[PDB]
Design a protein around this ligand. Structure first.
Ligand SMILES: CC(C)(C)OC(=O)N[C@H](C(=O)NO)c1ccc(-c2ccccc2)cc1
Ligand SMILES: [Mg+2]
Ligand SMILES: [Mg+2]
Ligand SMILES: [Zn+2]
Length: 889
């Protein structure tokens, strides 16, 4: 099993200048003819010519139109084509090949494959080698001339990168289209699409050069009515890149295409972006609210790649976070500006501190620029993407908007049209840093540690106030736990956005301030501080760290009520909850361990409950924010703070705390559920697909959150509200009515009712599957078996498989059943999926990521299932490598 090392990067001994492809799609096979115009590079040392080529059936290969013969002149082992150097020309030459591939049975969804009745490619990272021979690495830049042919009736729409320069009929009911794409690109940005596609289109005029850009969004005919929001999102994306970054689209056309079978959300192939249908298609009748932010995010993300990834590309795959962290950051700026809701930023933090922090404290922990890899398909992690985006965001926090924009433009101007590394970006930011600090001595050398050092830093605080001196001190300490990547962790450049709140009137006591912590510890002193403040720390979540604020619950309540920063308010709430959770957890644990006949639990702080009521009853407070304060922290966040976590004890702990708060606030919750109805469920724009109101969707989130709390509590006659809710036109509402009805005898009636509403829309049915999967049912294992037999069956669609099983794995009480039956079940699904789609099989391993954080019995149960999966004779490279790293084998 070959390990690739970052330190080992060396340029190729060859050059590929021109790619000319003929892709001939037939019923039982696809024939790919390729001519590569090549040359010898300055780094060449007379080596064999070795192409990547995986699963290809060779008809013939040639050099300069002379047929090569197997054994004497070349070898092929289904992975590498090796042409012996004595037969490799010493100057410019042409290599040609004809291979047969089989998209119809390509269920791994990499290379060229069939999704329903659409032929589509997915080449990032190393998929182009599954289509034809190539030196499949992103620093091999070439020009592409691509012809596609196919049955005209089955495949009337043909697409590839660049301009369509010819269309022609072919005897036998076939037809062809030729696409020429002169600008250099890496092969992972190649794409082809063939199918009976329908479209919506628009013309966009660029802000400065006034170029007309044709925008096309495509789907199968059945779902063409779900394309409108995507087209709007694309127009929004283009405008934002223009307005914030001064960047215009450079091509005459941009196509977006939805397909049903896709391993991830979408892919940024140049001028031809390809999407999981669940991240492009929506309608108000057939989609839950979450779809609208999802499409905005994913469309935005692939568009922003056109600069950060496509025009400025990667030298090698170790630089992945340079395009992904940066593009996620750009998409976050975009979405925050489009939604105008504080919950956008909060949702990203919530995801980072649960999922990414868990990864970073797991055996899988890696820095955002790893030192090695075995599987590129396993490389696309929340660390690289989401911690990457926070590292990219910190530059903006450090520099401020004006100088950040200056640095970013330096990066784009200097590297446009070329490959780049993480150092190039840091260099550009450093120039802006020098400008900002007004001295050419300033540098960001220490900042590079964010790329190389793994683990989550812990930042802790102590305070001092001298009333006579009016002098306030913040003592700050950072620490990163040693792990397998660094025995000794170095201090990072940590920017700490801070405010000081006057506790008597809630007002700001200082101007905007970002502390630059660059040592293991520092003391920051403030003069003329008239009264002892409450510090507002890491505003906007200004660094990806564990925050230990060392504040009392009284101080945290004051911030929650009166601070100006949404994240600090939310975090203060989070911290109050965590203190309660840890306390009650240990009390339940003791009772379990000692087999106590009686014991005491510490109640929830009454002033905290009062503060929640205060905020809920404030008509000017934000609905989305309100939904966060009545929800306990995610389980995957909590587990970062507890050793040997007993999931049953945690379930009892959460139950107690929710019941404590509900016993006081349920009447408030109910009053709000009712008073919010009018605005939340307003139908005025239900048939306008371009009208999207993120505040109104947040009101529905709040209502559905409250309905869940009230239902669990068996609030008097709440079943009436549930039934009425099931009749709402909004799928977010009537799917919610299904999951909250879990606690009542009407569950299977709503099950059938909502299934009937869902079954005739592919994506809606998948949302229904998720709702059933995450239902809080005691008979959930029987229900999953029912889903398997009646709906899922032997579908190889990753959306179907993920919908049925992943939400269930978040059922704390049931998935972690002490019998191990839940672990057994998902391991069986992983092994089954691994036979046809290793990438998705590895995704389905996600619940096992915390295995060594659980109680010893559950660790053993999980470890056993992973060892069982590892012993399967037919285990994929993906799954084997992943489980070996996860189990520390
Ligand atoms: C959600 C968000 C938008 C952040 O990301 C995604 O939807 N897609 C990613 C991505 O970065 N798109 O730009 C992405 C991730 C992985 C692949 C891949 C890698 C190997 C093989 C096959 C596929 C391909 C794409
Ligand atoms: Mg093959
Ligand atoms: Mg299907
Ligand atoms: Zn991306």
């Amino acid at each position: 099993p070959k390990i690739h090392y970052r330190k080992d990067y060396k340029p190729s001994g060859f050059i590929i200048n021109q790619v000319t492809l003929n892709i001939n799609i037939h019923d039982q096979e696809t024939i790919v003819r390729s001519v590569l115009d090549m040359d010898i590079s300055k780094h060449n040392v007379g080596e064999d010519l070795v192409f990547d080529g995986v699963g290809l059936k060779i008809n013939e290969i040639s050099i300069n139109n002379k047929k090569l013969v197997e054994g004497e002149e070349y070898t092929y082992d289904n992975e590498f084509l090796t042409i012996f150097s004595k037969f490799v020309p010493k100057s410019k030459f042409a290599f040609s090949s004809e291979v047969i591939i089989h998209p119809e049975t390509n269920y791994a969804l990499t290379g060229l494959y069939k999704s329903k009745n659409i032929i589509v490619s997915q080449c990032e990272a190393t998929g182009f080698r599954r289509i034809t021979f190539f030196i499949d690495r992103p620093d091999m830049m070439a020009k592409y001339d691509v012809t596609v042919t196919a049955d005209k009736e089955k495949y009337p729409v043909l697409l590839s990168n660049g301009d369509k320069v010819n269309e022609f009929e072919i005897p036998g009911g076939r037809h062809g289209a030729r696409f020429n794409d002169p600008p250099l690109k890496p092969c992972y940005l190649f794409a082809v699409v063939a199918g009976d596609l329908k479209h919506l289109s628009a013309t966009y005029i660029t802000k400065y050069t006034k170029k007309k850009v044709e925008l096309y969004v495509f789907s199968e005919e059945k779902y063409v009515s779900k394309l409108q929001w995507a087209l709007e999102c694309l127009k929004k994306s283009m405008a934002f890149d223009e307005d914030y970054f001064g960047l215009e689209y450079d091509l005459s056309r941009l196509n977006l295409v939805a397909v049903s079978d896709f391993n991830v959300g979408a892919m940024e192939n140049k001028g031809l972006n390809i999407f999981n249908a669940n991240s492009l298609l929506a309608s108000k009748k057939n989609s839950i609210d979450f779809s609208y932010a999802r499409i905005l995010t994913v469309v935005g993300h692939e568009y922003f790649h056109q600069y950060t990834g496509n025009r400025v590309t990667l030298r090698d795959w170790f630089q992945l976070t340079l395009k992904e962290g940066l593009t996620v950051h750009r998409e976050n700026l975009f979405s925050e500006e489009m939604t105008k809701t504080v919950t956008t930023r909060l949702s990203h933090v919530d995801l980072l501190r649960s999922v990414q922090f868990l990864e970073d404290s797991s055996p899988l922990s890696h820095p955002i620029r790893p030192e090695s890899y075995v599987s590129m398909e396993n490389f696309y992690t929340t660390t690289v993407y989401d911690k990457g985006s926070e590292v990219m965001r910190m530059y903006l926090t450090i520099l401020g908007e004006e100088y950040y924009k200056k640095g970013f433009d330096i990066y784009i101007k200097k590297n446009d049209g070329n490959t780049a590394t993480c150092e190039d970006f840091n260099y550009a930011m450093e120039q802006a840093y020098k400008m900002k600090k007004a001295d050419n001595s300033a540098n960001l050398n220490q900042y590079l540690l964010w790329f190389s050092q793994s683990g989550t830093p812990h930042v802790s605080f102590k305070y001092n106030y001298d009333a006579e001196k009016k002098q306030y001190s913040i003592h700050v300490n950072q620490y990163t736990k040693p792990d397998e990547n660094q025995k000794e962790k170095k201090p990072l450049f940590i920017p700490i956005s801070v405010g000081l709140i006057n506790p008597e009137n809630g007002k700001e006591m200082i101007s905007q301030t970002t502390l630059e912590l660059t040592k293991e510890s520092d003391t920051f002193v403030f003069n003329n501080i008239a009264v002892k403040p409450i510090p507002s720390l890491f505003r906007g979540f200004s660094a990806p760290v564990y925050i230990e604020d060392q504040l009392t619950d009284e101080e945290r309540i004051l911030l929650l009520k009166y601070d100006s920063d949404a994240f600090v308010r939310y975090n203060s709430c989070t911290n109050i909850y965590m203190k309660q959770i840890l306390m009650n957890y240990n009390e339940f644990l003791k009772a379990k361990n000692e087999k106590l006949e009686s014991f005491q639990l510490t109640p929830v702080n009454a002033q905290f409950i009062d503060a929640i009521k205060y905020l809920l009853e404030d008509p000017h407070a934000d609905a989305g924010f309100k939904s966060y304060i009545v929800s306990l922290p995610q389980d995957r966040y909590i587990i970062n703070f507890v050793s040997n976590l007993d999931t049953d004890v945690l379930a009892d702990t959460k139950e107690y705390i929710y019941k404590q708060i509900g016993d006081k606030l349920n009447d408030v919750y109910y009053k709000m559920f009712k008073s919010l109805e009018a605005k939340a469920d307003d139908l005025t724009y239900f048939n306008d697909e371009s009208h999207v109101d993120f505040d109104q969707m947040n009101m529905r989130t709040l209502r559905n959150t409250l309905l869940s709390l009230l239902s669990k509590a068996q609030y008097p006659n709440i079943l009436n509200e549930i039934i009425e809710h099931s009749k709402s036109p909004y799928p977010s509402n009537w799917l919610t009515s299904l999951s909250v009805s879990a606690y009542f005898d009407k569950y299977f009636e709503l099950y059938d009712k909502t299934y009937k509403l869902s079954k005739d829309d592919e994506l809606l049915l998948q949302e229904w599957l998720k709702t059933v999967s995450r239902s809080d049912r005691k008979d959930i294992y029987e229900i999953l078996k029912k889903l398997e037999n009646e709906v899922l069956k032997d579908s190889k669609n990753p959306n179907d498989i993920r919908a049925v099983y992943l939400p269930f794995t978040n059922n704390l009480r049931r998935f972690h059943d002490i019998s191990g039956k839940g672990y057994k079940l998902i391991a069986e699904v992983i092994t089954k999926t691994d036979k046809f789609n290793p990438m998705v099989a590895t995704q389905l391993c996600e619940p096992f990521k915390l295995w060594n954080k659980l109680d010893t019995k559950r660790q053993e149960l999980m470890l056993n299932e992973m060892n069982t999966m590892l012993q399967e004779p037919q285990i994929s490279n993906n799954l084997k490598e992943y489980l070996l790293r996860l189990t520390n084998k």
